[PDB]
């Protein structure tokens, strides 16, 4: 390891120590609102009074920031220095600042947040000591002068070389570049960790979730050919969706639904995986819009998968959960919806499950068959299981009515079924 | 049948004939002992150069290998040969007609395991002696105790307790007593490999089904269970570097790096050894280093390395995928034809039945290079 | 005599003591038995001052021998000093439909 490398390491360690006047004017001139000159000339007192006003406004907006006023925004906070504290106190600072960035990721359209974060930059040197958290915080505002300035003053950790090419230009970074960024595989793990933190602290919001889910969609879209890449990329996005469903916010539920839909339609998953996705969605379904989206997602997943045992009967627990969280009338009007999304394999499996399990709502079964335009082999499977249930259970008027419905619609298939097995 | 003109010297183009290798240290120079059929070689591990080679052929093939600091203990058909620098320096005949099948050494007690579930314990004649030569005692395990002897281990911090792992359960034997001091519960699945974790009193057991039982000896209970289906676990190793990663070598020729702290899967390597020759026959993290050495059954020995993370803040979460590092290899089938590439007797071409062409160095085998088959354009 | 409260406050201001801030940072939080025993292993005793490794292990100048149990508790402390104890074993053990079935299947499949 060459001496040049070892000294580069030591320079990294001593990045934030101002060992002489010139280096100090650099570290102090880097700032968020004021240009280099005024930044270099002004003082901690001025910056801090602005910060106090701004954070007071933000606390008035929502009461959470008071703790930061207590711990990072005192005259003692004017006094202290990063460099002359011990390792433990350094970690405490880092935890506090990460929490503050998590809170402040939500109001990056407020000059109050701009001013307060400007204090934090200028006194605690976040723009050097901890830039991953800052970038991850503000990444979804990527079309804004605030983000352009963060790039201008930041030093880029090795993952963000795309933004590196866009530092100090004049045009904002583009969607395609952000898609390269996310298309990386390590950065995906990083951003996964960030979302996990956001969820566990219940600090998520629409615009952020929109950007996250759109980026994930485009990631799988660009990777829509390299199937090895898709296979190794499954665990990351599907774990993100797992936790995003474990959350409670309807926004999280919808985002997880969308990611799951696109991922399944772009890559054919296994029956067990699609089953588990169903189970989790059904477990955490709570409200109306989430219900709507989850139903569409399930339909699409079963229209995807295709293999031996394609439309087999749903397992007991999954079927019970599904009928618990969904009503026959609800699915009926869903079929009656004018769009009528193609629920073919899903409806077939649902019907077979009902036939094996309930054996009561046969008239709803009939309404289903009339409402949906089925297909040949699916109908044949239905007829086969119907023959089996007829030979097992007592004969029913609605049952023979179903048979008559088949007579009106392709009795000949009934004929093939019975001649293959029966009279 | 001894000649009068020629005398056997050494064997090119073999790095491992399939039996598990063993690692060891001499101060800093980490070394890897690997068998080749009727003889065994000792590689360096910083460059995978050659350091020593057994000068005297064993009458039959070596079955089990082990190595403490400076001595290598080989165990072929009936005996145990204690070797120093590849020179046979003490034979040890066993008082049976069976074959020794496992071997472990610790303290002043060597312990061998022969296929009739028979354990032999040998002691040094003196605390300051170098290798054990006195026969201390003999033990046997019958079917009521456990099945066939799968492996022998010596957990850290155990006076004269030898752990024996069998196809059904685990036994602890106090040898200076010659007694069974604790037996385990019964495991539903045949046990296929064992390893002593760097933490205390924990041994990792790989089954024939995708089961890794991390079992504690004191509390006598399965601390943890890691599930991999449709896979025959074949090797275990632990990361002593300072991060809690486990490497599982599965006989289908794959490698799986798990993180125990997050119950997670860092990375999986596919086809790092030809499956048909047994897949991973041993994988081992070098102590205190982020370097995994894997030997297969296809005459191949490799070293992969873990880079430091790229994330300045996250790190342990965004852990790097392993990078391939340096390796050596030979033919899969016996060579068909050989020739000398030059007058200075440095390189030898050998073409084998594996549809392959190779050039093997003669001085220090660091240069076992396969000649690519990449057509020039017309 | 102890200082008054306002005196403590003025002293904090004048000296620039930050220990209050340090304390707030430290208190800061995101609010939003064996199975088998061996008698002879217990009653065994070994010498101490005869080798340098045991000499570095020991804790008393004048002791020369110790019983097996103390010897092992202390040798175990040594081994712990060699390899730090990790949390995955330290503080964790295994021993309507759920939410984490998807994660379980992800774990089980390649």
């Amino acid at each position: 390891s060459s001496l040049s490398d070892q000294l580069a390491q030591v320079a990294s360690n001593n990045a934030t120590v101002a060992l002489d006047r010139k280096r100090r004017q650099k570290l102090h001139s880097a700032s968020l609102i004021y240009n280099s000159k005024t930044a270099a000339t002004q003082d901690y007192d001025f910056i801090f009074e602005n910060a106090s006003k701004a954070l007071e406004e933000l606390s008035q907006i929502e009461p959470k920031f008071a703790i930061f006023s207590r711990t990072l925004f005192s005259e003692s906070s004017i006094s202290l220095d990063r460099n002359v504290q011990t390792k433990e106190e350094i970690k405490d600072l880092d935890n506090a600042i990460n929490a503050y960035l998590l809170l402040a990721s939500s109001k990056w359209y407020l000059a109050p947040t701009l001013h307060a974060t400007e204090w934090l930059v200028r006194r605690f040197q976040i723009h050097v000591k901890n830039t991953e958290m800052l970038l991850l915080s503000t990444l979804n505002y990527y079309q804004t002068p605030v983000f352009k300035r963060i790039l201008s003053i930041i030093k880029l950790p090795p993952l963000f070389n795309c933004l590196s090419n866009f530092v100090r230009s004049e045009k904002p970074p583009t969607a395609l570049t952000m898609i390269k960024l996310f298309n990386d595989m390590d950065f995906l793990k990083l951003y996964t960790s960030y979302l996990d933190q956001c969820i566990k602290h219940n600090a998520t919001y629409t615009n952020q979730l929109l950007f996250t889910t759109c980026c994930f969609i485009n990631v799988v879209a660009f990777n829509s050919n390299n199937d090895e890449k898709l296979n190794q990329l499954v665990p990351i996005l599907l774990e993100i969706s797992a936790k995003l469903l474990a959350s409670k916010s309807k926004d999280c539920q919808i985002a997880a639904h969308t990611i799951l839909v696109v991922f399944a339609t772009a890559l054919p998953l296994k029956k067990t995986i699609i089953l588990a996705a169903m189970e989790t969605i059904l477990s955490n379904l709570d409200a109306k819009e989430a219900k709507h989206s989850a139903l569409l997602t399930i339909c699409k997943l079963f229209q995807t998968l295709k293999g031996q045992g394609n439309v087999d009967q749903l397992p007991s627990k999954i079927f019970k959960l599904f009928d618990s969280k969904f009503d026959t009338v609800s699915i009926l009007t869903f079929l009656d919806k004018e769009d009528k999304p193609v629920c073919d394999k899903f409806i077939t499996s649902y019907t077979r499950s009902i036939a094996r399990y309930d054996r009561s709502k046969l008239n709803i079964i009939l309404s289903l068959l009339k409402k949906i335009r089925l297909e040949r082999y699916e109908v044949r499977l239905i007829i086969t299981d119907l023959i089996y249930l007829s030979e097992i259970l007592e004969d029913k008027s609605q049952l023979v009515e179903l048979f008559e419905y088949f007579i009106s619609i392709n009795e000949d298939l009934v004929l093939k079924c019975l001649k293959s097995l029966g009279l | 049948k001894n000649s009068k003109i020629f005398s056997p010297f050494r064997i090119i183009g073999n790095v491992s004939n399939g039996v598990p290798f063993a690692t060891g240290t001499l101060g800093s120079t980490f070394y890897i002992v690997t068998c080749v059929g009727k003889t065994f070689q000792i590689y360096d591990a910083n460059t995978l150069h050659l350091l020593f080679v057994s000068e005297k052929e064993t009458p039959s093939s070596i079955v089990a290998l082990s190595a403490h600091f400076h001595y290598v203990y080989a165990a072929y058909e009936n005996k145990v040969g204690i070797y120093k620098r590849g020179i046979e320096e003490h034979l040890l005949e066993l008082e049976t007609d069976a074959n020794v099948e496992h071997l472990c050494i610790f303290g002043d007690y060597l312990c061998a395991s022969t296929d009739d579930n028979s354990i032999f314990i040998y002691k040094k004649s003196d605390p300051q002696d170098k290798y054990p030569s006195e026969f201390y005692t003999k033990l046997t395990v019958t079917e009521i105790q456990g099945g066939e002897i799968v492996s022998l281990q010596h957990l850290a911090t155990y006076l004269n307790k030898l752990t024996v792992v069998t196809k059904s359960n685990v036994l602890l034997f106090n040898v200076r007593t010659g007694k069974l001091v604790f037996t385990s519960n019964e495991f539903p699945d045949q046990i296929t490999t064992a390893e002593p974790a760097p933490v205390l009193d924990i041994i990792a057991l790989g089954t024939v089904t995708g089961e890794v039982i991390m079992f504690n000896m004191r509390k006598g209970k399965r601390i943890r269970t890691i599930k991999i289906p449709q896979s025959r676990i074949s090797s275990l190793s632990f990361r002593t570097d300072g991060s809690s990663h486990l490497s599982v070598g599965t006989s289908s020729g794959d490698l799986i790096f798990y993180d125990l702290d997050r119950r997670s899967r860092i990375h999986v390597l596919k086809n790092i050894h030809r499956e048909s020759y047994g897949g991973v026959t041993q994988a081992t993290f070098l102590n205190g280093q982020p370097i995994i050495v894997t030997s297969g059954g296809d005459n191949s020995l490799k070293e992969y390395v873990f880079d430091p993370s790229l994330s300045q803040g996250s790190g342990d979460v965004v852990v790097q995928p392993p990078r391939y590092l340096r390796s050596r290899g030979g033919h899969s089938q016996p060579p068909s034809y050989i020739a000398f590439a030059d007058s200075q007797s440095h390189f030898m071409l050998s073409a084998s039945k594996d549809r392959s062409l190779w050039s093997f160095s003669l001085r220090k085998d660091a240069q076992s290079q396969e000649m690519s088959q990449r057509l020039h354009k017309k | 005599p102890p200082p008054d409260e306002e005196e403590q406050l003025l002293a904090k201001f004048v000296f620039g003591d930050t220990t209050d801030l340090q304390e707030n940072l430290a208190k800061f939080n995101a609010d939003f038995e064996a199975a088998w025993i061996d008698s002879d292993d217990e009653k065994i005793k070994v010498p101490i001052l005869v080798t340098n490794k045991t000499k570095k292990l020991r804790t008393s100048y004048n002791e020369s021998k110790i019983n097996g149990v103390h010897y092992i508790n202390r040798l175990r402390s040594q081994f712990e000093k060699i390899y730090p104890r990790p949390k995955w074993v330290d503080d964790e053990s295994d021993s309507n439909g759920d939410i984490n079935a998807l994660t379980k299947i992800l774990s089980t499949t390649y």
């Binding site: 390891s1 070389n161 | 403490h68 610790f106 303290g107 850290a156 002593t240 205190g288 370097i291 | 070994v46």
Partner: peptide, 28 residues
């Protein structure tokens, strides 16, 4: 530009370990 995955050298430092000789001891 894409993220640079630079390979570097690895120098295996000293790896202090445990002693089974210390593990095994003579009786009283």
């Amino acid at each position: 530009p894409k993220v640079v995955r630079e390979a570097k050298k690895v120098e295996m430092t000293e790896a202090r370990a445990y002693n089974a000789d210390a593990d095994t001891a003579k009786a009283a």
